[PDB]
Enzyme design. Structure first.
Site: not given
Ligand SMILES: [Mg+2]
Ligand SMILES: [Cl-]
Ligand SMILES: [Mg+2]
Lengths: 415, 415
Positions: A172, A194, A238, A273, A307, A329, A331, A360-361
């Site tokens: 991403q 992304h 996305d 997305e 998402d 997705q 999560k 997650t980042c």
């Molecule tokens: Mg998304």
């Protein structure tokens, strides 16, 4: 094998806790920080260090199992458990979870993970990030007791008989959708970028003309930069519901536009997305389901990735049962116990729905290795390069782990 | 305990292999890429993916030790071993090294690491990066056999009887020396920001006026953004010899200028890396020595950090013996066998010299964990947050590993 001790340390993550509420109220920018007052309980600044807790399970044989508790960037935002400050949550682990693990005979991963995923303290469920880290550590403990990889443990317990193979890695870009694309091409991301297309006018274009230009640019950029002519990654972009916004969630009109993007992407395959983001889960399911049906009935070669509104295991099943898109997705941090990731992927598999093993980042190197193992074990369609926004580091962590795990698995197969 | 199997996998790193020679010849920027012909042999583009080799040593008990081979950004540049392509070097390990490891008894780290650091293939020394990864894996193998941390093994074998404490983490900014400073403040880097002051006119100022302004900005920014009032990081700014250049290597002129920087940095303590970069090692040692003598004589409490011309363990000893600066950079990837890091740190410490346990943005999550343990074990003055240029990820990997090691060491003390 018994667990003999449990240790907790506070730590950092790949990113930041951001007060989403304050940002949405219009927080200003000052360098890498935001200005103005906080809105969300717990925040002392609008942007602050992301936090983790490393959970160590010292085993009877002296090995140490390791998982990391972590939460999303927007920790403590609407619908989420409180801001995940290590200082607030180490005590619950030390007082409530450690005594339940110390002296425990290590059994199978599934029952232990489900126990710790579901346990209550004073009648209340545990913080999602606690469940995340504890179950990672349990997975690693089972792997270490059995002297195999975490992926093999998960495959045995959730996907028996299956091979464990490489999973496509999805990187991403954030807003740096040009430079980070270059990084991705050079690092041979299987799926990219992304592109954070999260504004109709600045990023999509009012008629989608900006994302159209971007897709063409991306196609040409891959062709220009790629070291190998046969590097043919999948586009995954996305749009944050902006296609829905730009075309009034008109099924035909969105499909026609998405068709122009597919055509612009050729020879590369396109995944979009979050095409729309409507007013409740039911209508999101419906619009995703209906747009897929339009695309498929017409043979438009584009995939939709769910998402928004698809959060929980129940939501995953719901979107899956209804063909609400082509890929769902999963999560990872938000699911709590990592066993839920495995159940969610296997549900998608059983029903022929693409599973995107996400993240997650704002989680950690360790948590990324753990969930990568699970994505591999369950034959997910793609896994996230994470954490961090550097791109390089996330790719490295995930892909190196992937390669190592395949090496160990391949060795075992040949013994 | 024996090693029973060795597996090598190709991987990624936190950054890129860049053709330094081609860049110095004027390769142009295009996104995150460089334009034009390569100059350095091995390179197919001026910028390519940085590469690692994960080395796994399977032990008889089923445990798997793990080190990563890696090289600097400017792999294959002047004075460096050839471009570190996994494909060029996996076969070397597999043919020449694996047979020496398979069946090998785990004894103590030091004699094992020394043997593999020094071993030859057809009379030639091994690539630095191979020795780097092999010896990491050996360290981890010893730690796992003994059921202790890598830091504990190194402390036992190189720093007997010492406590293992946290080490200041030093984060680097690259050219993004403002926003990355914000990141570092928020992540509470102990030492920051490097700042990549690698140009006289554009970055130092011809009279040093730009760096003076920057130091003032840095000072004010920390005070503005810090969550805790008692957060007081040490400044560490690398000037790439440009102070020497701006002031014709005049000891007094250089000392006068550095004094104005120390005065500007107050209340924060200042370290200047590489104030001059002269024509040979001997004259580099002399300039560093003399500039330090001048600053100390005047009681200007600004430290100098050696880098240029100080490479090998011999160099470290030479610079140390002559008080050629206050702190020496211990260049982890370049020293080959990681035992050499321990020897170098311990030498500095025995002799009143600061040890900076360094590294490269182009190494891995794993190599970073390993050298962090080493810097901790030997009580280095600071360690690099690494790898990558994301800042977040490097700080996360190094600091989290430091926290966990301390928890495990603290537990063991008490057992
Ligand atoms: Mg998304
Ligand atoms: Cl960009
Ligand atoms: Mg330097």
């Amino acid at each position: 094998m018994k667990i003999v001790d449990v240790l907790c340390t506070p730590g950092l993550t790949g990113f930041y806790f951001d007060d989403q509420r304050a940002i949405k109220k219009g927080a200003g920018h000052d360098g890498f920080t935001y200005t103005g007052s906080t809105v969300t309980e717990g925040f002392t600044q609008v942007r602050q260090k992301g936090e983790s807790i490393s959970v160590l399970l010292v085993l009877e044989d002296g090995q140490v199992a390791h998982g990391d508790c972590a939460a999303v960037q927007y920790s403590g935002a609407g619908g989420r458990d409180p801001l995940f400050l290590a200082k607030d949550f180490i005590p619950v682990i030390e007082k409530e979870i450690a005594p339940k693990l110390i002296g425990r005979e290590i059994t199978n991963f599934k029952p232990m993970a489900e126990e710790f995923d579901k346990m209550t303290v004073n009648g209340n469920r545990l913080h999602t990030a606690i469940r995340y880290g504890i179950t990672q550590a349990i997975l690693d403990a089972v792997a270490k007791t059995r002297k195999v990889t975490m992926a093999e443990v998960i495959r045995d317990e959730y996907n028996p008989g299956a091979e464990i193979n490489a999973v496509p890695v999805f990187a991403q870009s954030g807003d740096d959708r040009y430079d980070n694309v270059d990084k991705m091409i050079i690092k041979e991301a299987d799926v990219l970028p992304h592109a954070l297309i999260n504004n109709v006018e600045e990023k999509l274009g009012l008629k989608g003309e900006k994302l159209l230009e971007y897709v063409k640019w991306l196609r040409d950029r891959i062709i220009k930069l790629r070291v190998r002519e046969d590097y043919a990654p999948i586009f995954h972009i996305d749009v944050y519901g902006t296609i829905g916004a730009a075309f009034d969630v008109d099924i035909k009109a969105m499909a026609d536009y998405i068709q122009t993007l597919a055509e612009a992407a050729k020879p590369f395959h396109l995944r979009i997305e979050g095409p729309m983001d409507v007013e409740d889960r039911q209508k999101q399911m419906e619009a995703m389901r209906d747009l897929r049906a339009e695309l498929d009935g017409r043979g438009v070669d584009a995939e939709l990735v769910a998402d928004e509104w698809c959060n929980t295991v129940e939501d995953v099943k719901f979107f899956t049962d209804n063909k609400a898109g082509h890929m769902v997705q999963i999560k990872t941090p938000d699911l709590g116990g990592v066993n839920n990731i495995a159940d969610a992927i296997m549900y998608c598999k059983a029903n022929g729905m693409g599973a995107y093993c996400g993240g997650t980042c704002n989680e950690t190197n360790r948590s990324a290795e753990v969930t990568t193992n699970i994505g591999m074990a369950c034959g997910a369609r793609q896994v996230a390069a994470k954490p961090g926004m550097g791109v390089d580091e996330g790719m490295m962590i995930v892909k190196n782990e992937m390669n190592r795990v395949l090496a160990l698995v391949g060795r075992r197969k040949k013994l």
